[model samples]
Target: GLCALRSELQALRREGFSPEELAALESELQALERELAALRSELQALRG
Candidate 1:
């Protein structure tokens, strides 16, 4: 779902949204990225 969300964000940028909107979307994407990374770290610990 996160991957799909990221793709949609890129699509929005391609659709020519204003720079301000793009910046806001990028911030959201970054937050998702951080969450994904934290989840991965937790998974690694569980596996270990």
Candidate 2:
């Protein structure tokens, strides 16, 4: 899912998009990353 989004983002970056478009996808990427991290932490705590 992220690869799909990331692939588009990279293409946009290489292809050159406006700042708003870059920031929009970049923000979404970070949001997913943060949530993934949060999910792992919760699972880790349960395992611990």
Candidate 3:
């Protein structure tokens, strides 16, 4: 998902989209990152 989001972000950047669109996409990427972190934490907790 991160890879895909980064690829999409790069493609959109190449197309010269506005900062606002980029910002929104970035927000989604950030949310994915947060969710990933939470998932990792949950896994770690489960291991303990």
Candidate 4:
């Protein structure tokens, strides 16, 4: 899901969109990265 969005965002960027046009998706990518990191830590703690 995220990869697809990222791909589209990159495509738009390559086609010459403003940063403003991509800002929301960029924010979403950052939020998902943080959530993914948190999830990894939780899984590691459980396994350990």
Candidate 5:
């Protein structure tokens, strides 16, 4: 899942060049945080 996420960390097109990539990636990362939350929650639940 990380590889899948890692790949899209570079999602982009044209337009504002670096800003275009950076902006989208920022939003993508904030939203992607949900996955990390889910993972941590599951791992903690499984612990002990």
Candidate 6:
């Protein structure tokens, strides 16, 4: 979930990425989130 991704983002920020780098990383994270959103329904089924 985003919890872990957010943690990774926080660690990257702690490592002091440039603004451009951060923007690119954020974009990548958004794409990953979009993919995850689609998978959530299937994950829910597994849980069910």
Estimate every model's Cα lDDT from 0 to 1. Answer: 0.87, 0.85, 0.86, 0.85, 0.65, 0.83
Q: List model 2 lDDT by residue over 1-48, tens digit each.
A: 777887888888888687587897799898998998899999999999
Q: Show how many residue pairs clash in every candidate, following the order shown.
A: 0, 0, 0, 0, 0, 0
In model 1, state the lDDT of residue 10: 84
Task: Tell me the tens digit of each residue's lDDT in model 5 across 1-48.
Answer: 755655555454333348555777767776768878888899989894
**lDDT: worst 10-residue window of model 4:** 1-10
TM-scores for every predicted model: 0.73, 0.73, 0.70, 0.73, 0.39, 0.51
In the predicted model 4, the residue pairs found to clash are none
Model 1 stretches astray by more than 4 angstroms: none
Root-mean-square deviation (CA) per prediction: 1.5, 1.5, 1.6, 1.4, 4.1, 3.6
Q: How accurate is candidate 3 locally (lDDT)?
A: 0.86
**Considering summed lDDT, which 10 consecutive residues are worst modelled in model 5?**
8-17
How accurate locally is residue 9 in candidate 3, as Cα lDDT from 0 to 100?
Answer: 84
Worst 10 residues of 2 by lDDT: 16-25
Two-way lDDT contest, 1 vs 2, winner: 1
The whole-model C-alpha lDDT of candidate 6 against the native structure comes to 0.83
Model 2: number of clashes? 0
Q: Which candidate model has the greater lDDT, 1 or 6?
A: 1
Q: Candidate 3 on 1-48: residue-level lDDT in tens?
A: 588877888888889987687998888888898899999999999899
Which residue runs does candidate 3 get wrong by more than 4 Å? none
lDDT of 3 at 38: 98
